[model samples]
Target: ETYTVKLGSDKGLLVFEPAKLTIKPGDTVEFLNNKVPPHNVVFDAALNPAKSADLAKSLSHKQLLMSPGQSTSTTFPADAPAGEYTFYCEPHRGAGMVGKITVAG
Candidate 1:
């Protein structure tokens, strides 16, 4: 089944609630907009899972979701091995809005 992630914190913007997530194969995480606008989910392939920039690009949701109900999602692949995957919002990364999901093998 699919899962969920919160884009903004309960405290306010520029934060991801439950900052880290745990998932298994075939689990699609639907990251929802919560407290603010201009949110996105991006993975830095250059820094994560080395030499997987293309793979990261495939999973990232770069389009801006400017409303509280707007959102983008990512569906993990079956080939994904157990590892910690990190992501952040483009508008808030500098503000340190980051989070990760550890996928199960």
Candidate 2:
């Protein structure tokens, strides 16, 4: 399945919608930064499975800041181990702009 997650501003509030989510191993998640700009997704390696965290850290686009109305996506490969991944917006993390994504086998 494919899931869409919104980053920044929910009804005039700064937040991530569906702060927690679950998806199949091969599912994809699209993070749309339409409500705000200068945002970026950063996976917390310390909170995710080692392999998953490693892969996330290796992605170049992870460092790219988003423009208003922009979107980015990441797919959980079928072989990716089932686990939980915590992520947040770089600039807004202090504002508690964090969420979790779980991969299931």
Candidate 3:
């Protein structure tokens, strides 16, 4: 399955929409900067130890939404173990801009 997660503000609220998700291995998640600029998704290896360091290297970005309406995606590998993978925006993480993607093997 494929899902869309909004990266920032929605009606004055600053958060990742549907901050929790459940998906199967091989599913795709499209991260979108729907209501803000300068958002990026980071798949932290320390926060999600089930994923490899290489996987974190492959999935993260510097910053998204250099302009309006930017989007990016990451697909869980078919063999990815079932677990929670945490993602957050670097600048806004302190504001609680975080989410979890749960993959089912």
Predicted model with the maximum lDDT: 3
The segments of candidate 2 whose C-alpha lies over 4 angstroms from its true place after superposition are 51-53, 57-60
Off by over 4 Å in 1: 11-13
Against the hidden reference, what TM-scores do the models get? 0.80, 0.78, 0.83
lDDT of 2 by residue, 1-105 (tens): 578777666666667877788887667787777555667776766777664445664331554554566557777566545777777877676766788788864
Clashing pairs for model 1 are none
Task: Tell me, by TM-score, which candidate is best.
Answer: 3
- Please write out the lDDT profile of model 1 over residues 1-105, one tens digit for every residue: 777776665665566767788888546788878756677777777545444666665688765786576476688767555677888877777756788778865
Q: Candidate 1 vs candidate 2: which has greater TM-score?
A: 1
Checking candidate 2 for backbone clashes, the offending pairs are none
lDDT of 3 by residue, 1-105 (tens): 588877666666668878787877668888877655577777778877464687666667675567566567777667556788888887676656899888865
The positional error of residue 76 in candidate 1, measured at the CA in angstroms, is 1.1
- Candidate 3 Cα errors over 4 Å, as ranges: none
Every candidate's lDDT: 0.71, 0.68, 0.73
TM-score of 3: 0.83
